[PDB]
Amino acid sequence: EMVDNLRGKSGQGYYVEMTVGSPPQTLNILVDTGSSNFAVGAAPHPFLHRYYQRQLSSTYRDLRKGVYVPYTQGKWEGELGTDLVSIPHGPQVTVRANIAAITESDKFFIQGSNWEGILGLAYAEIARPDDSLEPFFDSLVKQTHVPNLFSLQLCSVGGSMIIGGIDHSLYTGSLWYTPIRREWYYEVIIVRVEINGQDLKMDCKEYNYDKSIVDSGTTNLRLPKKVFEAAVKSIKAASSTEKFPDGFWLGEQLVCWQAGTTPWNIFPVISLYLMGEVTQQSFRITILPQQYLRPVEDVATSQDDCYKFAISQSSTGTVMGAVIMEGFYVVFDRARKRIGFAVSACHVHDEFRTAAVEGPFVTLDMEDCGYN
Numbered sequence: 001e002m003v004d005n006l007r008g009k010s011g012q013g014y015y016v017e018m019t020v021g022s023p024p025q026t027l028n029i030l031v032d033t034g035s036s037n038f039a040v041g042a043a044p045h046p047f048l049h050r051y052y053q054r055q056l057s058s059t060y061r062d063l064r065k066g067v068y069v070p071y072t073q074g075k076w077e078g079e080l081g082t083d084l085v086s087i088p089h090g091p092q093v094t095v096r097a098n099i100a101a102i103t104e105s106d107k108f109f110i111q112g113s114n115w116e117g118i119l120g121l122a123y124a125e126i127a128r129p130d131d132s133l134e135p136f137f138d139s140l141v142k143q144t145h146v147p148n149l150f151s152l153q154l155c156s157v158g159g160s161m162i163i164g165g166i167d168h169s170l171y172t173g174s175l176w177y178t179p180i181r182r183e184w185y186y187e188v189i190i191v192r193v194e195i196n197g198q199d200l201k202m203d204c205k206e207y208n209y210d211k212s213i214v215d216s217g218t219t220n221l222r223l224p225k226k227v228f229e230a231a232v233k234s235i236k237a238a239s240s241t242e243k244f245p246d247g248f249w250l251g252e253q254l255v256c257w258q259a260g261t262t263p264w265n266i267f268p269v270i271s272l273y274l275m276g277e278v279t280q281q282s283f284r285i286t287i288l289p290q291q292y293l294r295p296v297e298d299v300a301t302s303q304d305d306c307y308k309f310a311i312s313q314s315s316t317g318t319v320m321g322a323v324i325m326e327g328f329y330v331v332f333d334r335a336r337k338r339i340g341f342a343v344s345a346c347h348v349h350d351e352f353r354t355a356a357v358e359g360p361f362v363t364l365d366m367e368d369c370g371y372n
């Protein structure tokens with residue numbers, strides 16, 4: 001009953017239905033593995049269809065503490081409290097959880113996104129104001145018998161968040177696991193990057209400067225500047241039969257082709273090799289251009305298909321965002337401190353190439369690829 005419990009608009013996040021308070025107030029909540037605060041709009045905003053009304057909830061408790069969270073994109077300010085929370089299309093339980101009631105925000109809520117709050121699924125270590133503010137999933141596990149893991153299948157868009165386990169109908173082939181290096185973000189280690197089979201040939205620590213995370217709340221694959229520049233050079237080289245403005249590669253403008261004629265074949269596959277559970281072993285996930293060229297829906301341009309380049313630069317480490325997660329089934333196995341990847345039932349592919357998760361691979365270089 002949890003399959004297809006996610007919805008969204010492309011590039012604007014995936015959300016699950018939840019209720020907060022007594023009686024239950026229904027809200028759509030963006031699922032974010034890249035943060036650890038549960039926060040909901042709690043005052044009127046031009047882009048909010050609805051919001052949390054604390055005065056109508058008899059179970060609301062004010063914690064008398066303010067909270068501020070600045071993300072890569074957007075920020076909000078709010079008041080901490082606790083209240084009863086449920087997930088109608090998830091486990092049939094009711095949890096008392098911390099909630100940040102958002103009373104002011106800047107460039108956080110998105111016009112027409114259909115969500116009114118955010119569910120930070122990462123660890124307390126990065127919760128604001130500090131790590132004593134227990135994240136939602138921790139509360140869920142402590143207060144119920146739900147097993148300590150969840151899985152995401154990100155595919156108008158839809159998908160599934162399976163709470164408490166793994167749904168085999170959602171993937172094919174094998175699940176490959178990479179260690180969670182540190183429990184704050186879902187931090188992993190990338191050991192090798194290839195563009196159309198060709199190694200970027202960097203010290204592998206560069207791929208994880210200063211950390212690498214799996215983040216459903218971020219759209220792009222974001223790469224450390226040095227890695228980003230190398231990647232773009234290689235993708236340009238592979239696609240050189242056509243020349244695009246420098247602004248496209250910086251994500252500052254779209255590229256468009258007559259509807260139905262996108263030249264997928266001139267763009268390379270990107271392979272990210274993730275550290276395995278065994279010494280010097282790894283597996284790779286392969287990303288097709290249908291993933292990193294993100295379609296931008298606009299009726300005005302609809303004689304064409306237009307795309308934004310969804311790989312961009314980062315000064316805070318690698319972020320494997322939604323365009324990376326889409327088409328894979330990703331298991332956040334908190335209990336065993338590992339992340340699993342498998343090919344999704346809604347995988348990307350044309351008649352020539354297919355997204356893949358495969359291994360094992362062996363590296364001869366014994367360097368630790370972790371930055372710290």
Ligand SMILES: CCc1ccnc2c(N3CCCC3=O)cc(C(=O)N[C@@H](Cc3ccccc3)[C@H](O)CNCc3cccc(C(F)(F)F)c3)cc12
Pocket residue numbers: 011012013030032034035036069070071072073074108109118126127215217218219220221222312321
């Ligand atoms: C879905 C909305 C969206 C669309 C398009 N682009 C987006 C984008 N960007 C910017 C450039 C490339 C890119 O993909 C970045 C983010 C973004 O910052 N995601 C947030 C969640 C969020 C969700 C909805 C609205 C705002 C934030 C996530 O927590 C970040 N994790 C690390 C993180 C960073 C900093 C602090 C924290 C902490 F404080 F929460 F821990 C976590 C959302 C984008």
